[PDB]
């Protein structure tokens, strides 16, 4: 059926009570089979943390497991994403991953989803008990973070526990990593700690064109500027970071520029990283973070112990270091805090002003927002960047002001961004 001793290393934790147990815990023989048969876990991403996570959840008594990943197997994966072989290059990570696991671990039951997370909606995500991430971009984490907050159901002010889906997020970057255990509408959420992310180096176009200094400066130019100017692989044809002839071409024009400026260091390997915005990765780290992550998944699902409070950062460069703390849930959160935020603009402020606030803020960092409001009992699109037809007809009004475009007071605006799937609200305060 399922063999003698298979789940011993797990049983001990579900059958025997204990000191550091969790309050709602209950020693029992059935626990295991209940865990094996009904706990549905969703793993997001199958690329390092992904694979690592599947192995760890499977060998921990999890059967019903779903994986989502839009990527295709590339060779530069084989040094850390062990579930794929060179004979898989080209196939869906999601599929090969599930394929591999269901075969290595007997009755495992991984269901793959060759989809991007934004392809599904609440309906699909309510389906799961616990969700674990091993993504590779901030935007995604923010999107899946928002999704889970939509799931919450507030009993007129009061939040219902059963509508909460625990979200375990992990991240890696060289010899550093970090795990996070989130609980929508309770624990600090991804948005709550959005400022823990380091800054990204953004080369001012002025020093990219007018005065290069580093090889990173010569590459960025031949990519962000020279390429559009003189279409290398036909007109209109985009820059494919994964096509050797493209990179081998930029590597060229870059040596030209670098040489013209007496800049040493332009290697082919550097043209790689600068273009693909590459992050150094090893297996060791992913194994660590994914491991932590699974442990917490096991805890939440079984109450065998008390879940990590909020965070954990790891580091290998110098010996071994891991700091654990409990992040504060910002009380004014564009995402998990319930009451709409409060903007402060002088009635004279133009639209493009309320817009730059969103985009350029620190607690918001929205990508390409869209503002709308109830203009005539009905609600109109003040401005929206997503489309272009709804963009043209709206940009002009990007110059008008608060009251100069019916913007009434004692009212709130609606914000939509590629960041989160939910709509965030802002209550405008004319205090000029």
């Amino acid at each position: 059926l399922d063999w003698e001793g298979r789940w011993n290393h797990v049983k001990k934790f579900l059958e025997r009570s204990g000191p550091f147990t969790h309050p709602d815990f209950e020693p029992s023989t059935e626990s295991l089979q209940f865990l094996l048969d009904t706990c549905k876990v969703l793993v997001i991403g199958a690329g390092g943390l992904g694979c690592e996570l599947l192995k760890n959840l499977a060998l921990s008594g999890f059967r019903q497991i779903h994986v989502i990943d839009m990527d295709t197997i590339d060779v530069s994966n084989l040094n850390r994403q062990f579930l794929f072989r060179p004979k898989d290059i080209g196939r869906p990570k999601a599929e090969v991953a599930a394929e591999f696991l269901n075969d290595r671990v007997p009755n495992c039951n991984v269901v793959p989803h060759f989809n991007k997370i934004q392809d599904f909606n609440d309906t699909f995500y309510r389906q799961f008990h616990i969700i674990v991430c091993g993504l590779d971009s901030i935007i995604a984490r923010r999107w899946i973070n928002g999704m889970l907050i939509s799931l919450l159901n507030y009993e007129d002010g009061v939040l219902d526990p059963s509508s909460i889906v625990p979200l375990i997020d992990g991240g890696t970057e060289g010899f550093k990593g970090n795990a996070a255990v989130i609980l929508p509408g309770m624990t600090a959420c991804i948005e709550c700690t959005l400022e823990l992310y380091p800054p990204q180096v953004n080369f001012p176009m002025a020093t990219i064109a007018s005065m290069p200094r580093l090889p990173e400066h010569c590459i960025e130019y031949v990519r962000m500027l020279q390429w559009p100017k003189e279409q290398p692989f036909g007109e209109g044809v985009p820059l494919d970071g994964d096509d050797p002839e493209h990179i081998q071409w930029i590597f060229q024009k870059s040596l030209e520029r670098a040489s013209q400026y007496n800049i040493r260091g332009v290697t082919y390997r550097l043209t790689q990283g600068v273009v693909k915005r590459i992050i150094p990765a090893v297996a060791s780290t992913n194994a660590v973070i994914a491991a932590v992550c699974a442990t917490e998944v096991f805890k939440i699902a079984t109450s065998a112990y008390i879940p990590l409070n909020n965070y954990l950062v790891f580091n290998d460069v110098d010996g071994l270091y891991t700091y654990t703390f409990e992040a504060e849930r910002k009380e004014n959160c564009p995402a998990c805090s319930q009451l709409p935020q409060n903007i402060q603009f002088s009635p004279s402020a133009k639209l493009q002003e309320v817009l730059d606030y969103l985009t350029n803020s620190a607690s918001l960092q929205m990508k390409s927002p869209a503002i709308t409001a109830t203009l005539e009992g009905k609600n109109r699109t003040l401005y929206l960047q997503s489309v272009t037809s709804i963009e043209e007809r709206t940009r002009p009004n990007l110059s008008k002001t608060l009251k100069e475009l019916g913007l009434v007071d004692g009212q709130e605006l609606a914000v939509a961004d590629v960041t989160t799937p939910q709509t965030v609200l802002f209550k405008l305060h004319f205090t000029s």
């Binding site: 390092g48 970090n178 823990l196 950062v313 580091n315 504060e328």
Partner: protein
């Protein structure tokens, strides 16, 4: 005041700070000592992730208290 601040590598360094100094300046001390740009610095005192415009008092930082340089990663 004589406060401590464990870096990302566990290395703990001390600082010259009066309850009046902004979080911003506390970061300015670490850099001077370690080289960690205040720009990529994320300090945390008891779950609170210090805003670099508020003062060391705003967080109840009392001499022997310990700060923590933490971080968050994008890859995975």
């Amino acid at each position: 005041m004589l406060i401590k601040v464990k870096t990302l590598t566990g290395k703990e360094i001390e600082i010259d700070i009066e309850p009046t100094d902004k979080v911003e300046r506390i970061k300015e001390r670490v850099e001077e000592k370690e080289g960690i740009p205040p720009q990529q610095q994320r300090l945390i005192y008891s779950g609170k992730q210090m805003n670099d415009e508020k003062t060391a008092a705003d967080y109840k930082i009392l001499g022997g208290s310990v700060l923590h340089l933490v971080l968050r990663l994008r890859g995975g």
